[PDB]
Design a protein around this ligand. Sequence first.
Ligand SMILES: [Fe+3]
Length: 192
Amino acid sequence: SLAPLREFITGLSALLDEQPGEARILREGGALLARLVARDDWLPDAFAQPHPEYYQQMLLHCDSAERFSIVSFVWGPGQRTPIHDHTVWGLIGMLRGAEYSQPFVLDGSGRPVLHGEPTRLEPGHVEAVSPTVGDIHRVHNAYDDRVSISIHVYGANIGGVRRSVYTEAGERKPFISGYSNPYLPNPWDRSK
Ligand SMILES: [Fe+3]
């Protein structure tokens, strides 16, 4: 039941064991994640509950060597992120509902400016971020009336990464996201 999550963890671990370049991580990791979010039959309800004020970032798994971490992002109705970056590679897989992602780039003085049209991420689909491919964005729930969920995989313990968020007026601030959950799931019991 949690087996798809275990299979993703061990599949991604095997991929990263090969010391791949980022481009291959995003592509072949992207396919691994799309397989995980293709069927919505594994995420326990406890990791899908929204918070009335804040979007939830629930850690599902962190790699011992901190090569990656997996998070359930639970969007309450109409919720959105600030503009922010990541500083490491990231893959976002849509599980439930949908989200819009808007790219930003920094201008001459380091302020974020709109870059292009936003994209809509649908269930089963995956999108990448990184310093290389485009790292700064704002994401929001495509729905103002229901919960959406995406599964995020980052090339570090994301809850510990020192990165940047932008204020509403467009100033840069240091940012460490942390996690909402004291408890992680247990996908490791192979006794049954
Ligand atoms: Fe992000």
